[PDB]
Design a protein around this ligand. Structure first.
Ligand SMILES: [Zn+2]
Length: 258
């Protein structure tokens, strides 16, 4: 049946419907810090989220998306390894059933409790749908979450989860500022890759931040309370919605720092 993260429709089976699964620029990967190349030609990232307009939060049955108004250049990313302006469309997370797993990307084989993805599309392509068809169509900023101290800026999100418990549900989610989810440092790793869910198109320039943010145990606990299923269907907790690391193949990971 359709794809998911269960035993019968999980990452190991995706290739059957999406052959690109075994492609050459598949994501996520393990970041080997000793093999990453410092590239001093990379510029510092430019994050302009002060005009961000969040609109809604939805449970799509695979994660929860907070969506933004992308009809104009309100929340954009530029600089780093990018050419042009990338507009924020939505953010979502990947997490685990236990605190020692959940991230998609790994650092020297280390798994984090969750991974945040801020999704941006290249404005030269006019819409998100056209951007996914290009090798430079998307820019995703990935941020790792580790369990420690609560992140104040994440509570507004945690609190609305009850209202979007099952697949298909949505809730108005206005005035959320994504600046509350960034670490102090903007040092990063970058490589060419793909979406981590079907259709797994190879259109992403990944921007993975070196510094994780901390969340509290009780914060991540609330994530694990969501459901994959739709209302009135038998309950399947939304946990472990992460794809394992894929072969790097012919790619170089560059670092913005030494
Ligand atoms: Zn993601």
């Amino acid at each position: 049946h359709h794809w998911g993260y269960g035993k019968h429709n999980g990452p190991e089976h995706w290739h059957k419907d999406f052959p690109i699964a075994k492609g050459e620029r598949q994501s996520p990967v393990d970041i080997d810090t000793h093999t990453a190349k410092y590239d001093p030609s990379l510029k510092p990232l430019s994050v302009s989220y002060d005009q961000a307009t969040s609109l809604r939060i939805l449970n799509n049955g695979h994660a929860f998306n907070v969506e933004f108004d992308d009809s104009q250049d309100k929340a954009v990313l530029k600089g780093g390894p990018l050419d042009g302006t990338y507009r924020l469309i939505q953010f979502h997370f990947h997490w685990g059933s236990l605190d020692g797993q959940g991230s998609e990307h790994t650092v020297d084989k280390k798994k984090y409790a969750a991974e945040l993805h801020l999704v941006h599309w290249n404005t030269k392509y006019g819409d998100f749908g056209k951007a996914v068809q290009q090798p430079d169509g998307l820019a995703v900023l990935g941020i790792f979450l580790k369990v420690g101290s609560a992140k104040p800026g994440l509570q507004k999100v945690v609190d609305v989860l009850d209202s979007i418990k099952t697949k298909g549900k949505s809730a108005d989610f206005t005035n959320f500022d994504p600046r509350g989810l960034l670490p102090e440092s903007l040092d990063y790793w970058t490589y060419p890759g793909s979406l981590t869910t079907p259709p797994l198109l190879e259109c992403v320039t990944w921007i993975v931040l070196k510094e994780p943010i901390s969340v509290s145990s009780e914060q991540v606990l609330k994530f694990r309370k969501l459901n994959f299923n739709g209302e009135g269907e038998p309950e399947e907790l939304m946990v472990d919605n992460w794809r394992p690391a894929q072969p790097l193949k012919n790619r170089q990971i560059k670092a913005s720092f030494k």
